Design a binder for this molecule. Structure first.
Ligand SMILES: O=C(O)CCc1ccccc1
Length: 404
C-alpha cells in the first residue's frame, strides 16, 4: 500500500504545526501589550497554560490513538487547535486568551503531536529512532516557519495580530487535517520489510505504567525538560549581563534553534546505529557541563554560541531519545499509551520550569542559582539514564501454549 516514508512526511507536518502553535506567543508579546495593559508575564501565562494542557493531553491522545487509531485523534486535534487559535483571534481579555490559546489550542496540539510519534516507528522497525525524530523535528522547524509569517501579517496595514491568529489558525488546521487524514499503522499482520518454542510480546499500558523503570524514565524526562525550560529563556540575558550588546547576544543564542532542530533527526540516526543508553547519558552529562560552563564561556559571542548550540543539541535530543527508549523497553504495540503518559512529565516541566527559573534569578539577582539547579537536575538525569537498562521481555504463554 502506501510507501513507508509517507508516515515520516506526516509526522513532519503535524509536528511542524505544533511548533508553530508553541512559537506564536512570543510573536504576540508586543502587539498585545500595545493594545491592552498586558504584561509580558501575563502573555507568558498563556504560553505556560498551553504547554501544561498540551503535555497533559498527549496521555488521552495516546490512549485514544491506541484504542481507535491515530487518524481520528490527529484530525480531532486539528479541529480543536483550529478552533482555539482562531478564537484567540477574536479575543478581548486575558482569560479569553488563556482559554482559546492555552486550553483549546493546546488540547488540539497534544492530540496532533502524539499519535504520529507512536505510529511512524511502526513503519520503521529497522530505524525506530530516526522515524520518531521525523515525528518530532517539526517542533524545531515551527519557529522558522511562523516567525516570518506572523511578522508579515502583523506589519501589513489591512491586517494585524488578530489576523495572525485567524489566518495562521486556518493554515495550521489544514496542515493538521492533511497530516491526520493519511495516518494509520501498518496493517495488522504483515510488516513492511525486505529483511527482519520461546515467544515474547510487547508490554501493555497497564504493565508498563506499573514498571519502576517507566517512572525512572519519567523522572529523568521531567529533570531534563525542566532544566532546559528553566535556563534557555535566560541565555541572551546572561550574555547582555556579561557585556555583550543585545544584538550580539541575540545572534549568539539563535544558534540554539538550528541545533535543537538538527539533533532530533541526527540523534535518532546515531542511536539507531549504536544503541541508545550511552549516547543518551552522555547528552545529559554534556548538558550538566553546559549549565556549569556558561559561567566561563558565556561572555563572548563565540562562547555563548557554543553553549547555546550544545544546550539545543541535548534539549532537542530528549524528545527523540525518550520515545525511542520507551519503544525499546516496552515495544510499539502500546507505545501510544506508554509514551503519552510519559510525556505528561514535559507538560508539567513546561508549566513550571520557565517560571521557576525566572523566580530564582529575580530572587537572587544573578544567574548562579537557576543554572546551578539546572545542572543538578541534568546530573540526576545523567545518573538515571545511565543506570537504567531495559526490563525483561515478556513471555506470552497464551501464544506459547499454541505449540502442540
Ligand atoms: O519539543 C517538543 O517536542 C515539545 C516540547 C514541549 C514541552 C512541554 C509541553 C509541550 C511541548
Amino acid at each position: 500500500t502506501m510507501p513507508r516514508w509517507v508516515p515520516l512526511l506526516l509526522g513532519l507536518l503535524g509536528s511542524t504545526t505544533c511548533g508553530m502553535l508553541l512559537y506564536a506567543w512570543s510573536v504576540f508579546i508586543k502587539p498585545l501589550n500595545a493594545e491592552f495593559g498586558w504584561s509580558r508575564a501575563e502573555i507568558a501565562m498563556a504560553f505556560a497554560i498551553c504547554c501544561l494542557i498540551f503535555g497533559l493531553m498527549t496521555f488521552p491522545a495516546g490512549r485514544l490513538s491506541d484504542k481507535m487509531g491515530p487518524r481520528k485523534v490527529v484530525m480531532t486535534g486539528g479541529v480543536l487547535l483550529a478552533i482555539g487559535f482562531i478564537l484567540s483571534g477574536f479575543i478581548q481579555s486575558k482569560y479569553q486568551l488563556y482559554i482559546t490559546y492555552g486550553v483549546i489550542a493546546g488540547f488540539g496540539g497534544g492530540m496532533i503531536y502524539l499519535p504520529p510519534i507512536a505510529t511512524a516507528p511502526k513503519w520503521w522497525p529497522d530505524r525506530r529512532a530516526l522515524a520518531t525524530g521525523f515525528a518530532v523535528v517539526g517542533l524545531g522547524l515551527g519557529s522558522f516557519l511562523m516567525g516570518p509569517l506572523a511578522t508579515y501579517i502583523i506589519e501589513k496595514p489591512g491586517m494585524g495580530w488578530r489576523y495572525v491568529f485567524w489566518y495562521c489558525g486556518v493554515a495550521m488546521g489544514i496542515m493538521a487535517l492533511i497530516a491526520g487524514a493519511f495516518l494509520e499503522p501498518p496493517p495488522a499482520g504483515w510488516k513492511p520489510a525486505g529483511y527482519t518454542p520461546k515467544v515474547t510480546r510487547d508490554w501493555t499500558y497497564e504493565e508498563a505504567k506499573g514498571d519502576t523503570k517507566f517512572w525512572l524514565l519519567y523522572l529523568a524526562y521531567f529533570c531534563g525538560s525542566f532544566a532546559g525550560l528553566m535556563v534557555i529563556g535566560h541565555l541572551a540575558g546572561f550574555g547582555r549581563d556579561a557585556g555583550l550588546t543585545a544584538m550580539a547576544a541575540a545572534g549568539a543564542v539563535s544558534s540554539l534553534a538550528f541545533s535543537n532542530a538538527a539533533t532530533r533527526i541526527l540523534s535518532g540516526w546515531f542511536v539507531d546505529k549504536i544503541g541508545i543508553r550511552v549516547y543518551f547519558a552522555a547528552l545529559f552529562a554534556l548538558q550538566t557541563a553546559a549549565m556549569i560552563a556558561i559561567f566561563q564561556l558565556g561572555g563572548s559571542v563565540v562562547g555563548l554560541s557554543i553553549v547555546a548550540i550544545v544546550i539545543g543539541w541535548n534539549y532537542g535530543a530528549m524528545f527523540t531519545l525518550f520515545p525511542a527508549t520507551c519503544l525499546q523497553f516496552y515495544g510499539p504495540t502500546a507505545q501510544g499509551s506508554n509514551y503519552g503518559l510519559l510525556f505528561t512529565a514535559c507538560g508539567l516541566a513546561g508549566f513550571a520550569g520557565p517560571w521557576v527559573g525566572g523566580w530564582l534569578k529575580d530572587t537572587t539577582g544573578t544567574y548562579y542559582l537557576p543554572f546551578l539547579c539546572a545542572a543538578a537536575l541534568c546530573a540526576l538525569g545523567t545518573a538515571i539514564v545511565f543506570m537504567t537498562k531495559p526490563p525483561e521481555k515478556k513471555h506470552a504463554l497464551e501464544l506459547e501454549v499454541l505449540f502442540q
